[PDB]
RNA sequence: UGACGGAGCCAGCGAGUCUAACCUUGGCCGAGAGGUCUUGGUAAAAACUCCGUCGUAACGAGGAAUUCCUAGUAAGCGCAAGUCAUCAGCUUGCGUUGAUUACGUCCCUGCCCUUCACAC
RNA sequence: AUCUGUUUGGUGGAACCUGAUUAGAGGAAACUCAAAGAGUGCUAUGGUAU
RNA sequence: CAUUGGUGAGCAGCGAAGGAUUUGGUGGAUUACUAGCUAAUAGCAAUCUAUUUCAAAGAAUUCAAACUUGGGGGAAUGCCUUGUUGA
């Protein structure tokens, strides 16, 4: 289903004709074509926006197909399947081709690179590898199964370490500088990668609740009776009120429904993540709701370019002495806010085209980042808009030639 | 039933309660309406749960063995392991029940017809 | 996949055995709803039956094309693939193209080693509709077998009196668009299954005015095909051979794809039989 | 039981099993040392594994590979990808996972086919 | 036929079969009662007769005309038609008509 | 409901149907949620939904879709035949 | 981009107590039928890699016109089977070695189709 | 005997078919603990109670 | 010739008043450390209980109360509902 927010209106809704479910989808960059792949029928369906009607099927899948992406610059359609195989579909054009790569194993989740180059996957093995589109080969890979912090289910009766319960990645993405992949599975961990050297970055736990069942690696010996573990005892019969009592659980559901129909604790488990394309912060989806990180409060000290003559005090008085360019650039080194705010706010009107056509190229992706974060809340809206239509006056040839690095910034 | 015998409301709902039951693997046969009430048990129900349909695969010897199996840890569906013996399994998601990738199982079944590969594992 | 094709094919068979069971039950049936309408007494059998009466009240209420094409019939356009046997002479090269031509949705594969499980399989994989493997005599087509997927069936047919295209001078180019279809003298339920199997090549619902016809004439288990391309004169209809010419006649029918040599035989041609010239099964 | 790893390697109709085990770098195909491997001039060909990931490693390991099947060259290329298979498995068996993880970003940097199946599956267009 | 729904449509099938079946259908098999104890069918039969009697004691007094019925069978009053007891008692006692 | 949880959630999808519903025109805040925030201010209905050429009323005049309006009299003749036969292809089509 | 010889070495299909010559010279045994022996004529993995030797009437790679062909494709090599139709003046399978050039364009030649938001 | 290859006995138990059974089928120990079945032994004796 | 088959007989090498395998019991952890009992604004911890009783407060016509049932057909005698007879 199209959904148009302006209107709220579902403005029109796609269905296959053999009825079939799906569980992953891809939208082209001009919004023009929708893609769709299933559990059930192992090939990827095509429709037109505009029309409605089924464009085409795409087949040569011999497995269901598992995600399903575009890329942003080149418009080719990267599918992947349990097939343990990747498909590069060239739709557009005035001929079809398919390039197949095979893969050591299964393939869960895709991402692609804004630049539209590169496809990263994650298998079944716990591995994240980086293929090239235009040369079908691969570029680089990540171990990630000693990474993975997975938990032992109260109900288990194996180890968490002998467990292959949930050793993979079922979602990962870029984020859109593209040096870095952020990761999550069925599991109590959200790993963050950099693409370039192949390391973990941070690994953050996602949860420390005991109500929830997969956050323990080792469960208390205290629990076990000759019976079995303690809290596996159904103790609703003790509920005062009947309607804690009455039980509708089915027997053997595992999703899809209620909390009562399951009849098991619910387990820590991270459906999806995602980057923010405006801030350094990255949302992830799990049982308790989206977790939102964000690099926001900065209280870390991280310099860049030091030396022993940049000081606090010297900015300020460079500030005095009325050298504002060098007053901005010592306060960039030094790299903290509140001497940037102070630095930015106390240019006068006459010096910003100035200062900005001398500011060095290096800076320039830190001064956009904060004129950024600062004016959404910030009362000098004139000032800003000054500034701005200062910097892309002076810059903007070299803002178009790298766009991923200021994409999130500007 | 009791509804007229010409009514299409009659028509439809009972062809769909078929191909549901049919599908979920409830029921064997969808040509019969009489089967709803003849043909669902709960044996039609039992026998859909994953340690009966591995020992109709033949994965193991008996429905207890099977069991033992699924509790051990060696069992998964699709990508996703199972511990519950009393998945039930829709008639298409029997294909994808298979042994976990690093199991015991796996290396004895690749080790006894000398197949084994230690890259893949 | 393999597994997907495995089983379908199992509860397919199994569907066959009931059904075959079930023909005795659908009779009786039949029977309890003639004597209902016509007042007329039930047979002793069905009297004593108390089992079929109760059911009947739910079976009460119960009410063409064949299985393996129900699914798709008139629904999802036939994809062919034309191909020929290892090493083909230049001139079944021409004639498998024309072949292609004369279906419009077909492609012509080339096979250069390509191994008969490995080609099933790969069509499989893309969909493929139909296959059609060609083979050939000093360069004088001899036979044709159609080889519907996913679960067949296949059925073999040898060529006479096979005149290509090529043969003519200054013939010209063909008319793809979709063509209507005559069958004649398809009687027998083994004819109407072969009417069957060559109707779903084509695509389906040619426009009226189609300038394109293609007939499939049994003359004593002969096929003739014939294709031509008429113009509605003020004062009848005129019609002009685009060919290619060629008389086909069945000699084996399976259940199953053209790998699967073990596929069972819905048909054969009995040629050693006493009463063999008696009887046009088509 | 002395540490030990198998692994197949596959082109065309040629086939390779390769055994890795504890050793003194005695490498053996068909029972006979590399260096008789035939046809000469492809010979470079199997000892693309050995001199990629250096001969050090290979010090400390015996390495038995059993062909049959195919012709000169898809044999060949059996025999190279059973060994490299091999190397890998084992290193990652008995031996730190981060050498498991060099040999094969070396392997994969110099040829991808020394790792998966190169497997020509035919597709209909 | 098309309009008749609940109850009605399942009771008029099964009268119906039983008409058409009964020329041709051995008499033993085709109309068996449901199995119930002695206590409670002698108990159902002995009400039922008791309401006949009324039924009929009641016409009699008054100058109702009631349709007429063979010795042995049980005459058919609305109870018979809506508490489905035919089937629990039958149509007649047949032990004293084989007597 | 109960026979989907149980397959977990796997089942097969209904046969599609189609069904009518009708939309009321409303300022598009009040379909919104209750909070101090709206996302959208425009109307619940589209500029053509309100409104969308159609028929001359006075069967004199002649209306397109595209808004040019004509009138019979002032049309020269060769016109009238040339919108005539435009007539004659757009109904045959439908 | 040869010939001769030697050496090394690599496949996959295929398993019906069923698989396969002809015409002669004579000896012996036998009632015969025939049996046995003797006798002359006629017919009936390869590529690859290494080493050694020689040595560069018709026809010497096929005109005009015309046909086919896009990856394990074109082309080269052998090995099997002969599966109720066709085939041995051969047909069908199997493996081995394996490329160049395009994968765009509607310019020509043919065929075909057309005249529920936002934005256009 | 780089002779011959049937038979007796041992080992093993493909396919099809038939029958029985099924939280697979067994095994060992006992001054062990239970729930049942059959048989056998015992003056087993108040016809109306010193 | 090969065993990445079993069972043994011995070396080289490692090598401080020995070495190796298996196992029963208890103790501490496996959630983030504010003390025990009682009739609890304090007593007791050796208990009192020979003051532990009196007083005060405290009773919905909710005078409702299976949210708890496998499907089909019934239910003599029961039970529920409704009306009725006579006290
Ligand atoms: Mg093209
Ligand atoms: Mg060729
Ligand atoms: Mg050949
Ligand atoms: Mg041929
Ligand atoms: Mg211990
Ligand atoms: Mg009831």
Redesign the pocket.
């Known amino acids: 289903r199209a959904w ?1 927010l ?2 709220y ?5 796609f269905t296959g004709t053999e009825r079939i479910q799906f569980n992953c989808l891809a939208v082209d960059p001009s919004g023009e074509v929708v893609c769709a792949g299933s559990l059930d029928n192992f090939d990827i369906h095509v429709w037109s ?2 029309t409605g009607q089924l464009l085409d099927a795409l087949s040569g899948h011999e497995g269901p197909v598992s995600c399903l992406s575009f890329s942003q610059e080149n418009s080719v359609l990267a599918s992947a399947s349990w097939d343990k195989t990747i498909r590069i579909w060239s739709i557009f ?3 079809q ?1 398919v390039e197949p790569i095979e893969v050591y194993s299964d393939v869960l989740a895709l991402s692609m690179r804004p630049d539209g180059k590169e496809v990263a996957v994650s298998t079944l093995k716990g591995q994240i590898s980086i293929f090239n589109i235009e040369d079908a080969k691969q570029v680089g890979n990540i171990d990630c199964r000693k990474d993975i912090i997975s938990g032992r289910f109260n109900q288990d009766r194996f180890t968490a370490k002998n467990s292959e319960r949930s050793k993979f990645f079922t979602t990962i993405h870029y984020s859109f500088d593209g040096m870095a992949i952020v990761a999550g599975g069925n599991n109590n961990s959200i790993c963050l990668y950099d693409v370039p050297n192949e390391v973990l970055l941070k690994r953050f736990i996602v949860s420390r609740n ?1 109500a929830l069942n997969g956050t ?1 690696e ?5 629990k076990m009776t000759e019976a079995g573990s303690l809290d596996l005892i159904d103790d609703a019969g003790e509920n005062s009120d ?2 804690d ?2 039980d509708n659980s089915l027997p053997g559901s595992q999703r899809g429904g209620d909390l009562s129909t399951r009849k098991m604790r619910p387990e820590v488990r991270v459906t999806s993540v995602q980057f923010s394309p405006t801030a350094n912060a990255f949302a992830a989806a799990s049982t308790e709701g989206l977790l939102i990180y964000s690099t926001n409060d900065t209280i870390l000290f991280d310099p860049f370019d030091l030396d022993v003559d940049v000081t606090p005090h010297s900015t300020v008085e460079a500030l005095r002495e009325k050298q504002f360019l060098n007053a901005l650039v010592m306060a960039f080194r030094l790299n903290e806010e509140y001497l940037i705010n102070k630095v930015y706010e106390a240019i006068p009107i006459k010096e910003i085209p100035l200062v900005a056509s001398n500011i060095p190229a290096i800076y320039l992706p830190r001064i956009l980042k904060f004129i950024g974060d600062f004016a959404i809340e910030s009362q000098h809206i004139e000032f800003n808009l000054i500034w701005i239509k200062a910097l892309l006056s002076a810059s903007g040839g070299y803002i178009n030639e790298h766009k991923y690095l200021f994409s999130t910034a500007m | 039933s009791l509804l007229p015998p010409t009514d299409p409301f009659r028509r439809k709902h009972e062809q769909l309660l078929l191909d549901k039951l049919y599908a979920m693997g409830v029921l064997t046969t969808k040509s019969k309406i009489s089967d709803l009430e003849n043909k669902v048990t709960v044996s039609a129900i039992c026998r859909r749960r994953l340690p009966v349909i591995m020992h109709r695969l033949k994965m193991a010897e ?4 099977a069991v033992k199996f699924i509790e051990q840890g060696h069992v998964r569906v699709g990508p996703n392991l199972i511990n519950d013996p009393a998945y039930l399994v829709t008639r298409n998601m029997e294909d994808y029940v298979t042994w976990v990738d690093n199991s015991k199982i796996k290396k004895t079944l690749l080790r006894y017809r000398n197949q084994i590969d230690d890259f893949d594992f | 996949m393999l597994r997907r094709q495995a089983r379908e094919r199992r509860e397919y068979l199994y569907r066959k055995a009931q059904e075959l069971q079930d023909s005795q039950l659908q009779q009786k049936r039949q029977i309890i709803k003639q004597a209902l309408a016509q007042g007329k007494p039930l047979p002793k059998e069905l009297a004593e039956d108390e089992s079929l009466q109760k059911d009947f009240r739910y079976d009460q209420s119960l009410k063409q094309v064949d299985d393996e094409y129900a699914a798709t019939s008139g629904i999802m356009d036939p994809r062919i693939i034309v191909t020929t ?3 083909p ?2 001139r079944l ?2 004639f498998a ?1 024309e072949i292609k031509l004369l279906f419009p949705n077909a492609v ?1 594969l ?1 096979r ?5 499980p490995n080609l099933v399989d790969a069509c499989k994989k893309s969909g493929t509709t139909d296959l059609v ?1 060609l ?4 360069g004088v087509p ?2 044709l077998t159609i080889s519907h997927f996913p679960h067949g069936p296949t059925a073999q047919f ?1 060529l006479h009196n096979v005149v290509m295209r ?1 043969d003519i001078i200054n013939a010209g ?1 063909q ?3 979709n063509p209507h279809l005559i069958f004649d003298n398809f009687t027998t339920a083994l004819g109407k299954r072969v009417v069957c199997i060559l109707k779903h090549l084509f695509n389906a619902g040619p ?1 009226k005015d189609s ?1 394109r016809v293609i007939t499939f004439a049994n003359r004593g288990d002969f096929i003739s095909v014939r294709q031509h391309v008429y113009v509605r004169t003020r004062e009848g209809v005129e019609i002009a051979e685009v060919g290619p010419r060629f008389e086909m ?1 069945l ?1 084996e029918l399976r259940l199953g794809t053209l790998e699967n040599k073990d596929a069972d035989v819905e048909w ?5 039989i006493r009463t063999a010239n008696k009887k046009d099964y088509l | ?2 540490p ?1 790893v198998q692994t197949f390697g596959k082109k ?3 086939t390779a099993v390769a ?1 890795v ?1 504890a050793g003194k770098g005695l490498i053996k195909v068909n ?1 006979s040392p590399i260096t008789l491997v ?4 492809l010979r470079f060909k199997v000892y693309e594994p050995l001199l990629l990931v250096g001969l050090d490693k290979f010090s400390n390991i015996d390495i ?1 590979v059993r062909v ?8 060949v290329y059996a025999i190279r990808q059973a060994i490299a298979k091999g190397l890998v498995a084992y290193h990652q068996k008995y031996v730190d996972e981060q050498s498991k993880n060099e040999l094969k970003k070396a392997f994969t940097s110099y040829d991808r086919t020394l790792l998966i199946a190169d497997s ?4 209909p ?1 | 036929d098309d309009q008749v729904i609940g ?1 009605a449509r399942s009771r008029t099938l099964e009268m119906r079969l039983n008409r058409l079946s009964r020329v041709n259908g051995h008499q033993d098999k085709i109309n068996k009662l ?1 199995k119930v104890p002695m ?2 069918r002698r ?2 039969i ?2 039922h007769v008791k309401r006949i009697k009324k039924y009929e004691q009641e016409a009699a007094e008054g100058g109702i005309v009631l349709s007429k019925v063979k010795k042995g069978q049980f005459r058919k009053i609305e109870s018979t038609y809506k ?3 035919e ?2 008692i039958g149509g007649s006692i047949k032990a004293r008509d084989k007597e | 409901y109960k026979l989907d949880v149980l397959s977990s959630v796997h089942f097969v999808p209904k046969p599609a149907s189609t069904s009518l ?1 009708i939309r009321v025109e409303t300022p598009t805040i009040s379909m919104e949620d209750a909070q101090p925030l709206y996302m959208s201010n425009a109307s619940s209905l ?4 309100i409104y969308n050429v159609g028929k001359a009323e006075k069967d004199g005049e002649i209306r397109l879709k595209n808004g040019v309006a004509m009138s019979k009299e002032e049309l020269t003749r060769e016109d009238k035949n040339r919108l005539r036969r435009a007539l004659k292809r757009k109904r045959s ?1 439908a």
């Open positions: 148009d302006i209107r209106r579902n403005f029109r809704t926006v505009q054009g005035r001929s081709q005991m323990l080792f469960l208390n010996s205290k009947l309607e009592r009455i | 008996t429905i207890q063995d | 046997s290892r090493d002479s230049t090269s021409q193209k012509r080339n250069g080693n390509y191994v008969m493997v083979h050939e005599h000093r001899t036979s040898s090529h180019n008319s793809e668009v426009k300038e006649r000699f054969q041609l009995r040629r050693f | 039981a002395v030990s065309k109709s040629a055994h085990k029972g035939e046809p000469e001039i038995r049959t099947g195919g012709g000169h060259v898809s044999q020509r599956r035919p597709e267009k | 109850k449901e206590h409670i108990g159902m002995d009400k508490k489905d007891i089937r629990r | 519903e589209a500029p053509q939904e089509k």
